[PDB]
């Protein structure tokens, strides 16, 4: 995950700030997230074989991060609905940033780090 972040950082030539952005993303401050944060999430998603989003590998990643059967299913359900909502976004970098924000914001009522 750090492996995949570090790889993507070198491939896409991102500053150390991408760390600041993903931390901010996670604490639900989206105001300063730019397209490149989207490109980072596409890059990481591909390397984790999460990419259209792959349902099965999503559930695997979720359990892999300590999600039980029930919560993993809820997470991927929320991720799919976000993916549908923003399916029509041209720019696949912007599409990923928007899905990621939709996802993070709508997983509120779930115990998952």
Numbering used by the authors: 12 to 62, 67 to 128
What do the authors report?
Crystals belonged to the P43 space group, with two molecules in the asymmetric unit. The overall fold of EposPBP3 is conserved with other insect PBPs/OBPs, consisting of six α-helices stabilized by three disulphide bridges (Cys19–Cys54, Cys50–Cys108, and Cys97–Cys117). In contrast to other PBP/OBP structures available in the PDB, both the N-terminus (residues 1–11) and the C-terminus (residues 129–159, which includes the TEV cleavage site and the C-terminal His-Tag) of EposPBP3 appear to be disordered and therefore were not modelled. This may be a consequence of the packing arrangement of the two molecules in the asymmetric unit that brings the N- and C-termini of both molecules in close proximity, where folded N- or C-terminal parts of each monomer would result in steric clashes that are incompatible with the dimer interface observed in the crystals. Towards the end of the refinement, two residual elongated stretches of electron density that could not be interpreted as protein atoms remained at the dimer interface (between the N- and C-termini of both molecules). These were modelled as PEG fragments originating from the crystallisation solution. The structure obtained for EposPBP3 is therefore best described as an intermediate form between form A (N-terminal extended, and C-terminal helix folded) and form B (N-terminal helix folded, C-terminal extended). However, the top part of the cavity (which surrounds and extends above the functional group of the pheromone) appears significantly wider in EposPBP3 than in BmorPBP1. This results from the combination of four amino acid substitutions between the two proteins (Val53Met, Ile62Leu, Lys110Trp and Ala111Thr), and from a slight variation in the position of the exposed loop located between helix 3 and helix 4.
Insect Pheromone Binding Proteins (PBPs) and Odorant Binding Proteins (OBPs) are found at very high concentrations (up to 10 μM) in the sensillum lymph of insect antennae. These proteins form a large multigene family of small soluble proteins (~ 15 kDa) believed to function as carrier molecules to transport hydrophobic compounds across the sensillum lymph to the membrane-bound odorant receptors present in olfactory sensory neurons (OSNs). Binding proteins that transport important sex pheromones are colloquially named pheromone binding proteins (PBPs). Here, we have produced a functional recombinant PBP from the horticultural pest, Epiphyas postvittana (EposPBP3), and experimentally solved its apo-structure through X-ray crystallography to a resolution of 2.60 Å.
